[PDB]
Amino acid sequence: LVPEKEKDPKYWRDQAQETLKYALELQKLNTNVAKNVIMFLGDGMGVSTVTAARILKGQLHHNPGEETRLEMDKFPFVALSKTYNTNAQVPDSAGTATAYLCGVKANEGTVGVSAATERSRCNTTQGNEVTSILRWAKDAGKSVGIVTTTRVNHATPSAAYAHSADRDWYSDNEMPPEALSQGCKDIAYQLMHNIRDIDVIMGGGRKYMYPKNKTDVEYESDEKARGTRLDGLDLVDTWKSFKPRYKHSHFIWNRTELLTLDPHNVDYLLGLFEPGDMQYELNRNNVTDPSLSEMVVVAIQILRKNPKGFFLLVEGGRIDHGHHEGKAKQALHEAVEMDRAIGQAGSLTSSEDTLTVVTADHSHVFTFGGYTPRGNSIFGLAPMLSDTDKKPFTAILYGNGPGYKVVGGERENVSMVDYAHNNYQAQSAVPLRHETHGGEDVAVFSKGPMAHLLHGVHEQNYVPHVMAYAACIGANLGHCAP
Amino acid sequence: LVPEKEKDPKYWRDQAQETLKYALELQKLNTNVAKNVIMFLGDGMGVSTVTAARILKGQLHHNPGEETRLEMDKFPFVALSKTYNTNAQVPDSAGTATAYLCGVKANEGTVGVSAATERSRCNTTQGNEVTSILRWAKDAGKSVGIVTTTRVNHATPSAAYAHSADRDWYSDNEMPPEALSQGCKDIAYQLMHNIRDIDVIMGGGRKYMYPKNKTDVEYESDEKARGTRLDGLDLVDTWKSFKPRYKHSHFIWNRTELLTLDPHNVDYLLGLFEPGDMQYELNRNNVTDPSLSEMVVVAIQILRKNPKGFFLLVEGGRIDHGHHEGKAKQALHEAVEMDRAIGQAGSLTSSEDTLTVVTADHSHVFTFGGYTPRGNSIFGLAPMLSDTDKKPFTAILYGNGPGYKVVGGERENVSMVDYAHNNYQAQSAVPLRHETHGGEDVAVFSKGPMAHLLHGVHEQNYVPHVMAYAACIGANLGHCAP
Amino acid sequence: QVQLVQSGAEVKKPGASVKVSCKASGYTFTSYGISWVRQAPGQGLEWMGWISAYNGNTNYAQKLQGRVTMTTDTSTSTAYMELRSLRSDDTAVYYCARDKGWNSEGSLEYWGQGTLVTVDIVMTQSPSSVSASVGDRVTITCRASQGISNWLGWYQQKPGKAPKLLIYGASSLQSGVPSRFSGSGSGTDFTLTISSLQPEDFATYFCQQAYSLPLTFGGGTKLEI
Amino acid sequence: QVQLVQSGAEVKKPGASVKVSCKASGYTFTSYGISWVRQAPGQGLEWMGWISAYNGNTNYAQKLQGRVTMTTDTSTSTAYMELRSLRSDDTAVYYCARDKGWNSEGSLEYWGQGTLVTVSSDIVMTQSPSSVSASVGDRVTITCRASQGISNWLGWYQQKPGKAPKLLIYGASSLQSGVPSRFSGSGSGTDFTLTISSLQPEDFATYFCQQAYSLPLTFGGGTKLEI
Ligand SMILES: *[C@@H]1O[C@H](CO)[C@@H](O[C@@H]2O[C@H](CO)[C@@H](O)[C@H](O)[C@H]2NC(C)=O)[C@H](O)[C@H]1NC(C)=O
Ligand SMILES: *[C@@H]1O[C@H](CO)[C@@H](O[C@@H]2O[C@H](CO)[C@@H](O)[C@H](O)[C@H]2NC(C)=O)[C@H](O)[C@H]1NC(C)=O
Ligand SMILES: *[C@@H]1O[C@H](CO)[C@@H](O[C@@H]2O[C@H](CO)[C@@H](O)[C@H](O)[C@H]2NC(C)=O)[C@H](O)[C@H]1NC(C)=O
Ligand SMILES: *[C@@H]1O[C@H](CO)[C@@H](O[C@@H]2O[C@H](CO)[C@@H](O)[C@H](O)[C@H]2NC(C)=O)[C@H](O)[C@H]1NC(C)=O
Ligand SMILES: *[C@@H]1O[C@H](CO)[C@@H](O)[C@H](O)[C@H]1NC(C)=O
Ligand SMILES: *[C@@H]1O[C@H](CO)[C@@H](O)[C@H](O)[C@H]1NC(C)=O
Ligand SMILES: *[C@@H]1O[C@H](CO)[C@@H](O)[C@H](O)[C@H]1NC(C)=O
Ligand SMILES: *[C@@H]1O[C@H](CO)[C@@H](O)[C@H](O)[C@H]1NC(C)=O
Ligand SMILES: [Ca+2]
Ligand SMILES: [Ca+2]
Ligand SMILES: [Mg+2]
Ligand SMILES: [Mg+2]
Ligand SMILES: [Zn+2]
Ligand SMILES: [Zn+2]
Ligand SMILES: [Zn+2]
């Protein structure tokens, strides 16, 4: 494409000099106390995903896209994190979530416990629990908040309040009778019972809070949207009954109410907008379901009232599902939505007393390449045909997954199908039903006070040990000691 | 598999606290003048390659390998570089080399010129030439060294001394008559007739320096190792004509002569060890071929004599050739050798007045990960069979390349063949003759004086300018101003 | 440090009004509210209301409504409480107390010196009076008429001194208190345990709930020697 | 800055040795070598040798070998020449000069104030013309030719009457820092050119071309640019 303005060396020299001047002025370190901490988390957002999301965001506004900047690319400090588990070489969701939320690496499939426990065994989790950064923040007088686009009792958010030996125990319906006999409790019970004064909770998973065979308010005729609890306890009713009678609790469940509320008269909020996982960004309903940006804005406005500060945990957790199913368009669109939410949240707060950290838990086997020309659509074909079987191939490819297609001995001719659709699955090397994770290191972006302590290549469990250092919470209180 | 010492949370907490203490002590910025500059360059070394190399290096010493640290992982500061060209979305070698060696982004396929020149056209080169950092170092009185495992006139090294409109013009034999008729020179001629005071040269490409049909020295009977110049000009002979008669010039061509020199009695050194590209690390010979570590050590010992500093450019460019063929073992072993060379060079010099920068120019579509257990061999099978066709699959997979095998209508059954061989090609999704590049951002590791100016996610051409600022050379001399 | 100071003793006659002032120093005045507590001679603590120093919203007890007014002045950082139509049973010690934080206004952390003036969820405490020797272990139980979750606080009062906060939330120890004291229980039954007894730990203990207005204090357990 | 100072005049007698001292200040003494140049009254520059201040290795001209001794003392940072068996044609002006850097040891950058001593297969460098005349504001060019190919090792010096020579261009294409950009140099191999595009009243002097290819170092015959 080669725009005219880029044909002069002076343009690049001036750009580099301006970048140098900014980086030289940045030498003044910020040694304030992080009054507020915000942690953005993208499930399965490696480096290739970030680059593809940047290109897509640029091209959505009729640009080549390569030169554009994401809202997380303006974060001054960048580091790399190793994501291996104690038990596994390729990471998982629960173990990594424990690593970067509690500060201690653990096995796979176990939430909120150390590495001395064994998966799916109740009588080995006693005395091996670990407390997450949410508990440290709440014990210091700060507010706590959880915003997710997935279930509130999914692995990534539940690693902050739950101590369970299995991540598949969503409710007592999924727990085997042996675990019930030995006294274990499902994740929803711990969500409503472990920390009894969590201010803002937002996400899906509305069918794990109701007794069995209870019709849903939103979907009347859907048989999969009914309740699943075998106790007979209404968990939302319990949640409304654990708070002082002179305060306000709402339990909104759609977008009209979320827009109607004013944060100046709300103290506790519980939003369950979907029976299970919230819908994709491209499949979302405008009228009845809110986006991540609106939920983040309302949560920030509610939590901003505390003079001691707040700790907000935001998850863009549909990237992992979009990659697992094998569709790249969806996952890139939730990456773009996550970036928009980051920008909206950063607009409200001030960088002088707020530590913002964007991170990921692992990466996938997503790849893109093939000598594509400048300005080429990221979902388009490669410029040259294959030189072995004489067929076109797309730029986006997967190491494995359900995209592996072979029609009678030869791979699929891409020109016969609509590769620009919303539900198109790119071709892969080995056929599977779900594309696996990846062992690559992940990138951690950070800005705010004491954000320069994330510099080199380090372990994952180092992330929650520096934030607690900046806010004078946890076990190390030497930042603001005399 | 879950070592005992890792079963206790105190271990991880103490590790994190020690890391935090080191990061706190690191707050004392280093603002000295970088007398020496060393630039390590891994061709096609992305973010999956470096972690795979770390695992392989750990496992070579009978360890799980995930926790082991490479010599480049001890570098305090890490940044990210965007690697797009002004003509292509997916980068190349020549354009990126121009970007990070001259400070100006250029077209795809042209070395040393700006973006205003068209490929394979010599009359657009005039007036559009750009000088690299090597000229800036030489004009300040510093020493100059180029050490490569590929040809000395390959794209990556030639982007520092040559201004040509095509990469494929290695010699006048390879240039079209129309280009020769216009007074346009090749790269081998420009290596000797552009900077006549390059101190140390190490690499291959001995058949581009001799007249046509001239027998080689190592390979007498090989007809592929003969000379290629149609001009009849002996470039090795004319290299020992532009230097003072009271100096010392040697022209060694094997390892026995290299490990017999006295660096206190050598001023100019040229080493051409192979007719073309130097052999792989697994295929290297004991006696008549030196490794990268020995060459780097000798080059540093020779360049260390200058009381004004030196600039050394080390290029481990066989990783790209290993990846292009689909052989992961060769590429990973080349990366390990590059890391060993980095360690040796760091041992020789001192970090108080030397700026060491390890970087890469692009990345490939290499991926690995199949939910492999801890301690699993990086070249081993995945724990579970495929869900669809019930066949084993390896952990290492390529997006596209020559590894795509389908025998009769079904993909290859890996359990039949020797998947641990030196020349085994992993399976891929698209059948091609050569594995392509990738559009991912690359990682830049930095250490030394003023090494903290590479902090965020930036462009590639920003890299040289910082060095020119740290060494007080080039167009920005504001570091030495009183 | 944080310190609250009140005026001197005031003697009045029935019908006349009385004003009590409380000046606080050591913190940002608008960030915390002020509660007013009453203690009759020989009986337990009684609650009148509080006022927030940020927005000025006030809450008064139902028993004393129509006679208590509360004002705040952030310019001089003072809180005033005025009572009207004094009766023969209004003689008592009035305390100004400060809450702990944002959402914890049921836990009175810092207390005033106490001004002497001369003219629902029922909380039960057991035992009425317990006697023990030095170094022993004692346990005191507090029961609520309704489920109050984990909203409970334990206070200690030595004779002639203001109450001191020991445990808030029935399981969390206040900073500056020895780890010897322990609190446990939840729902309807709560317990406070002292593993080792010392000569400086003989006083009267109260349990107060922060679930629903009005705030109710326990009857008091006299831990004698 | 860097400055070199010598001793006074030496009125000698034939057969008596003479010692010349040169003290340098403003830089690290051991990092640079010291060369010695001679100029007869009214004739061109002549080279005697140099000595390295780091390792003490010395090079002497073959014509004057067996009579010149060069010593260095890093404690007081001085360089000494001793000359023996003085002849009737040894009266001249002796200069101590400092090289430019590590490998640019044939380019004499800083020069001494000159000591006037009164007694009782080499590459031949040709320079043309000899007595060129011009006026203010004009453009002039001077050519220098070597007997052998010397690559780009050539330097251009300017000397006014009664003053030490000054380095202008080194490498035949690089302008020395502080020199006005009016002067230009070009050429490689055998023939080289030095050009002044706009002449100035303060640029009337004698110009020399000196090669740094092989020992002994040879100076040009000199071109007298008169007004
Ligand atoms: C969003 O949720 C609110 C719940 O408060 C819905 O309001 C109810 O709507 C039903 C209509 O079937 C009425 O019968 C109820 O009386 C309403 N409740 C209240 C408190 O107003 C609202 O309709 C929902 N929005 C949408 C678009 O469905
Ligand atoms: C893959 O599909 C394309 C699109 O149909 C094929 O290209 C067609 O080839 C037929 C051969 O007779 C032509 O008549 C059509 O005009 C072509 N269409 C286009 C759009 O090019 C292509 O041949 C297919 N690949 C293979 C290997 O058969
Ligand atoms: C390394 O290169 C040197 C070149 O200098 C080789 O030395 C030559 O060896 C041959 C053997 O036939 C002799 O005829 C030459 O006279 C040697 N030359 C010199 C200058 O000594 C040396 O043999 C090479 N090493 C190996 C292992 O082949
Ligand atoms: C892929 O190859 C493996 C062996 O390399 C096959 O496994 C063997 O199958 C034979 C068939 O009778 C058995 O007798 C052996 O016991 C199996 N195991 C081994 C270790 O040889 C496997 O069946 C092949 N895949 C398919 C789909 O046939
Ligand atoms: C847990 O229970 C199982 C079965 O009841 C038993 O085999 C196991 O030993 C128990 N765990 C421990 C630590 O004893
Ligand atoms: C929903 O909102 C999107 C963007 O806000 C808009 O493009 C679309 O037209 C709206 N309606 C439907 C039915 O998607
Ligand atoms: C430059 O060279 C090309 C051939 O490569 C020729 O077509 C073109 O006319 C030339 N341009 C000029 C200005 O001579
Ligand atoms: C020499 O080469 C052999 C293989 O030919 C290899 O095993 C060995 O490691 C090499 N080095 C030495 C010192 O033997
Ligand atoms: Ca909904
Ligand atoms: Ca060889
Ligand atoms: Mg998740
Ligand atoms: Mg290369
Ligand atoms: Zn994940
Ligand atoms: Zn996943
Ligand atoms: Zn390549």
Residue numbers in the entry:
A (entry chain A), B (entry chain B): 18 to 499
C (entry chain C): 28 to 146, 164 to 269
D (entry chain D): 28 to 147, 163 to 269
Quoted passage from the original study:
HPP patients exhibit hypo-mineralization and osteopenia due to the deficiency or malfunction of tissue non-specific alkaline phosphatase (TNAP), which catalyzes the hydrolysis of phosphate-containing molecules outside the cells, promoting the deposition of hydroxyapatite in the extracellular matrix. The calcium-binding site includes the acidic residues E235, E291, and D306 forming strong static electric interactions with the Ca2+ ion, as well as R223, Y236, and T305 stabilizing the local conformation of the binding pocket.
The TNAP agonist antibody (JTALP001) showed high affinity to hTNAP in ELISA assay, and the scFv fragment could form a stable complex with hTNAP in gel filtration. In the cryo-electron microscopic study, the structure of the hTNAP-scFv complex was determined at a resolution of 2.96 Å, allowing a precise epitope mapping. In EM structure, the hTNAP maintains its dimeric form and binds with scFv at 1:1 stoichiometry, i.e., one TNAP dimer in complex with two scFv fragments. The binding of scFv on TNAP was primarily mediated by the interactions among scFv E132-TNAP K264, scFv S193-TNAP R213, scFv Y255-TNAP S258/R262, and scFv Y254-TNAP Y263. The structural superposition between octameric TNAP and TNAP-scFv structures showed that the scFv epitope overlaps with interface S, resulting in the predominant form of dimer in EM analysis. Interestingly, the supplement of scFv in TNAP reaction solution significantly enhanced the phosphatase activity in the enzymatic assays on wild-type and mutants at the octameric surfaces. However, the scFv failed to activate TNAP mutants at the dimeric interface (R450C) or active site (T167M), indicating the rescuing mechanism of JTALP001 depends exclusively on the protection of the oligomerization interface exposed. Different from the recombinant protein therapy, the TNAP agonist antibody JTALP001 was identified capable of enhancing the TNAP functions by binding human TNAP to stabilize its active form.
